[PDB]
Amino acid sequence: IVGGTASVRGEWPWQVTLHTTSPTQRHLCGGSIIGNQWILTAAHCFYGVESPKILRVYSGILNQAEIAEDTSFFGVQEIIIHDQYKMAESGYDIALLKLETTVNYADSQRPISLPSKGDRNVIYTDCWVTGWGYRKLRDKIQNTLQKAKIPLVTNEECQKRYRGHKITHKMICAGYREGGKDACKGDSGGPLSCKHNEVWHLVGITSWGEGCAQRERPGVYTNVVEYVDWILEKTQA
């Protein structure tokens, strides 16, 4: 996260840090708890990943330092990538991780509600982007979970900032005309939490953009509301 600050412990209980153990353990992506055994994250976060076996999901984490060889984690039983996904920039950048065990909810780890199809004409206030991602073009995973308040931008406005791309209605962007605050490498899969009437909603999933926090270059996120049917279909046994 660029231009953000340290989050308070338990302030984003749905945020998880997804690690890979190969070659050696490290943070790979962010993700969101949406069900007792479900993590919603980004599809392009599994590039080169041929097995769920090297994955480890950690919940209720604030500082990466809390994670050691003796720290408990959730194994991943299955990785579900949208069958239409090809690459972040083309859309459908969404994936579901079915955990091997159930998450016992608590103040430190609980699910975030998905937006409703009726929440489309709703103006989201208090939108934040979080993660342990880079702080700059060429930085490194951050120890403390970072947070940054970032306003949503209309698709038409976003499209103007990405003439070479096609910003579809299945995407949603957020950023400042002058940049300064934005997601960066490592925040992918991270949730775009947004407040709607006192209730936190998972509006988007950190997907892509050009550089980090650059002027006139809004972050691009998967428009979650457009996938509620897909999520239901894939999570219902």
Q: Which residue has the tokens 């702080």?
A: 135
Our CB check for ligand 412 shows the closer of 60 and 219 to be 219
Is 27 part of the annotated catalytic residue set?
Answer: no
Active site residue 44: yes
Q: How far apart are CB 103 and ligand 412 at their closest, in Å? A: 22
Q: Of the listed 19, 32, 59, 93, which one is catalytic?
A: 93
> Does the annotation list 120 as a binding residue?
no
As a whole number of Å, the end-to-end CA separation of the chain is: 35
Q: Is 93 a catalytic residue?
A: yes
- Between CA 19 and CA 17 the distance in angstroms is 6
Number of H helices, E strands in the chain: 2, 14
> From the CA atom positions of the chain, what is the Rg in Å?
16
What lies within 8 Å, CB to CB, of 173 at 6+ separation is 152, 153, 155, 157, 158, 161, 167, 218, 219, 220, 221
Is 134 within any annotated ligand binding site? no
Question: 143 or 235: whose CB is closer to ligand 412?
Answer: 143
Q: Pick between residue 45 and residue 62 the one whose CB is nearest to ligand 412.
A: 45
**Interacting residues toward ligand 412 by CB under 6 A:** 29, 44-45, 133, 182-188, 206, 208-209, 211-212, 219
Which residues are the active-site residues?
Answer: 44, 93, 188
Binding-site residues, in ranges, read 160-163
